[PDB]
Amino acid sequence: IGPKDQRPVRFDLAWQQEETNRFGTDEFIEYCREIGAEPYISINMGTGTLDEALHWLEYCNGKGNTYYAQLRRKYGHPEPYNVKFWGIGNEMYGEWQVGHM
Amino acid sequence: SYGIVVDPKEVVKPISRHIYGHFTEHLGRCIYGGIYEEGSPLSDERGFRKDVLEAVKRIKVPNLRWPGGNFVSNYHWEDGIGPKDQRPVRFDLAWQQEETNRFGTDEFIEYCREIGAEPYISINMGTGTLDEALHWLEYCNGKGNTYYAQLRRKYGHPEPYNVKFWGIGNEMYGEWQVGHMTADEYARAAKEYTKWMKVFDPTIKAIAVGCDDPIWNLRVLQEAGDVIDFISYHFYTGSDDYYETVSTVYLLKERLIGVKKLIDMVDTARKRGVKIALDEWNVWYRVSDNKLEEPYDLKDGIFACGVLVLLQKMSDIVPLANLAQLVNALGAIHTEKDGLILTPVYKAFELIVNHSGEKLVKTHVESETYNIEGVMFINKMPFSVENAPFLDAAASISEDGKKLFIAVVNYRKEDALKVPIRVEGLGQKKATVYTLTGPDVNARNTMENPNVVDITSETITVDTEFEHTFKPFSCSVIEVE
Amino acid sequence: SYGIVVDPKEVVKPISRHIYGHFTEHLGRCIYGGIYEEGSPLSDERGFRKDVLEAVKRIKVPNLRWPGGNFVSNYHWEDGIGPKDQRPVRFDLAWQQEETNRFGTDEFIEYCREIGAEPYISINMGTGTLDEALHWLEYCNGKGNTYYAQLRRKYGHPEPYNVKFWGIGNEMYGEWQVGHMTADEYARAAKEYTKWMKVFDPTIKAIAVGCDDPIWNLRVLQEAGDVIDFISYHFYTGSDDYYETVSTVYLLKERLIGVKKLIDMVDTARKRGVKIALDEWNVWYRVSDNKLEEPYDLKDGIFACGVLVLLQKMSDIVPLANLAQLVNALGAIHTEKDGLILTPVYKAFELIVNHSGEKLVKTHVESETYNIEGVMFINKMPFSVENAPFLDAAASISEDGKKLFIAVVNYRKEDALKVPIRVEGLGQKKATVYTLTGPDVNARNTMENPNVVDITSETITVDTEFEHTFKPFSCSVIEVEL
Ligand SMILES: O[C@@H]1[C@@H](O)[C@H](O)OC[C@H]1O
Ligand SMILES: O[C@@H]1[C@@H](O)[C@H](O)OC[C@H]1O
Ligand SMILES: O[C@@H]1[C@@H](O)[C@H](O)OC[C@H]1O
Ligand SMILES: O[C@@H]1[C@@H](O)[C@H](O)OC[C@H]1O
Ligand SMILES: O[C@@H]1[C@@H](O)[C@H](O)OC[C@H]1O
């Protein structure tokens, strides 16, 4: 999130590539609005934390003055996205998944 | 009753160059006041003690472990990078000191490149996270455009460091360790860190933590044996008694064979060829505090030669070992503000490392043996050894094949040994014998007298059969051809 | 290249007499039709096959294991005592037969006494209880007036049997065993059974169950290491390939050192001096059934010689070993109704037990070596061995110091080996070489030709230095007067 040119390059462990992060939450939601689809976001339970998932929800759905709701407005979207579908982890049973359980 | 037969034509196996490793922890005066001292008249402008640098170069360090040891288990590596004046001061839980972080990852790597050592970094599994380890690896080894590779460039090193040896936690079994873990926790955590680190850089070698508990070692091997490359073993020994100290070379030997057998009993590990890293070893029995300035005597240096000779013979099973530690803390070198002392434990490395081949040859030793019961280490654990030899040796040859080295330890406390030696198919020649010993088993070097315990040389003439007299409590290398 | 140097004055260690032990389970024709056959023209008044008895006496059995083996884990020893007519017929779940119990504890002990062997009884931990094991021990060893001591006397034996070796369970890790246990279960149970059995008789040696699972071995050693005497190990090997079979002597060697190192790592066990009981071993890879009449050939007998030589050099770690088994079932001896066959596995014992000393002396061997990858056992498990020697040897001396025995295995499949041998301080004398040999690696004895594979003797001249030409796939013992 934030100005594209400032987004960090990460090494994605799943597919072993440099992820530029130039497509991120705001681009994802914009693409959903464009095609008329409800966004369904999966969260990271491998290297992620509860705080991190709550911050993503706040950023997407917060109606108030919390840090992440304000951050969504600062980057261009005063109205909350209202993401209705949240995926609580992905394939956490498989040994191929980072931080499997 | 004593004798040595060597066949230089019969190559038993290579000798891994990494048996001569060292280790520096952020502990007391090992780093700050040891290898590194900003503003010493004895330091260069990077802060590296020049006299220490020279002493370290002379022992040709093949790899150097850093930064711990108990310290790394509460160390966040990012606190140690970037402009020094902006690095935070942290309270180190292990040794209870304010750590300034002025010696950090970039300084350690400069140190390694200076001395010609491979770096060997241990990661923080106590308060650390997988992401944090991957970042460390990315910063060090990343060749691409990831945030941490670019950060390495920004701070002045565009070329990756290529750190080859990664320590997957430190002593995670011990209640003393920050964030210590059960066997099952640590075995799963070792498998998780190693496998993902290897997805980023599959050429690294991963050392997992082992110890004396066979259940612990077995869980680690069962769970991570498909991915790790070594399991580690730490060995500290010594008492005031001469024989009690030096005989524990042969206790170490039985220990290594044990871990080796545990590896054999886990198919994935055995099939992959998982080996042992003896990545902390020394005499350690006199002091117990947060400085560990153990005053090594010649007794202790004979143990050290004994170990180095043992590793020459067993490096197929143990290809990696690191004396704990290089300077001050359990130090082979002891520094003071206006100089340094080279303890007899240093001298052991000075001898063997400068007078040893890359390949072990057939060496058969006849020796009388003794049995002993004694105590070792700071808590005076009882131990016993059966049939420790008074005489041991290992013969090695140079890679080109031009040079033969026969290392000999005479452990006998009172008596010189006159030893018949045979070396198959050797002409009459002159050879040089380098010998490390001193006036008594308790002899030390000091600032005032820095050569009480030193390596002397003597020219001798040698043939298919000859004899030589090995002084008591001595280690010698007969260098031939 | 090849050489042997012996110094008969440097005694390394004693050699445990119990490395040559044997084993008879209630399995197919091992007991019934093997050592025991009531009403046969070949049997005595006790039902003991007399021809089998003579062959068994010839190999000097130091101790004999009974009754199992998988059998014992559903055996109730009380079924096998008292007047034979009143012993109940039971269904043995192990081998799926009607067991008549007509051979029971009293016959087993009579058998041992007749052949001079110490009895070694395994207890039933599968459907058995502590009380039942204590009563067996009381029946065998009680000197007082307890019910079972008296019962032994009532059934015709006033003096206690003094059984010294007691097997605390049999292969309790295996899913195939009746009442099999987890490691934690068996380790607790081994401690409980052993400790109370020793309260009744503190002189007994207890053998607890080990296997290849190192966690299993450790739990047992951790829990019962303060009371047991041995942890046991079972080793079965073999394939159709010659080298693949015999090289497993040196696989066995690494297994034993492994289990020894486990013991070293458990303080109570190490301080107590717990050792290893190799209480089942043989080639076994061709037959899988209820009878296990493995047709041993010379290749398999050379394996067996290799193990006995290995056991002479390692008996301080493995003081007790038992070939599985004596008669018919994996049998050293094979019987029929009108005779017997002595297999090359039997011949290995016949050679070594008759030509071997009580003390091992310094023996240095030079040999070429090979590496091998093979399969072993009925399921053809892959294995590998590094640097197996083509030649091995162990020298021993008699108790009195009078005779020297140099046992030599030539594993080479095709070449005889002319070996130079030095014996320190040895006069120039004549000596005898006993050699186990036969025409090819697959040779067997039969009823028709009972001596195709046999032990030859030959006179030779020896001295401080001599040579001897050792046949390929053979084992020899050079016996010298000192
Ligand atoms: O280890 C160092 C110690 O010797 C010093 O006195 O306090 C700061 C520490 O970093
Ligand atoms: O930190 C300084 C040290 O480097 C020097 O050798 O002695 C004086 C101190 O001020
Ligand atoms: O190596 C260990 C050391 O780091 C700790 O502080 O004390 C116990 C030792 O075994
Ligand atoms: O590890 C063991 C040691 O602790 C003991 O003192 O004697 C034998 C070794 O195998
Ligand atoms: O008791 C059994 C007998 O009935 C069978 O026929 O052969 C041997 C045993 O397993």
Ligand SMILES: O[C@@H]1[C@@H](O)[C@H](O)OC[C@H]1O
């Ligand atoms: O010894 C074991 C045997 O008793 C069982 O029946 O099959 C597998 C073998 O390991």
Ligand SMILES: O[C@@H]1[C@@H](O)[C@H](O)OC[C@H]1O
């Ligand atoms: O037990 C191990 C075996 O299973 C393997 O095949 O090769 C090495 C041995 O030590």
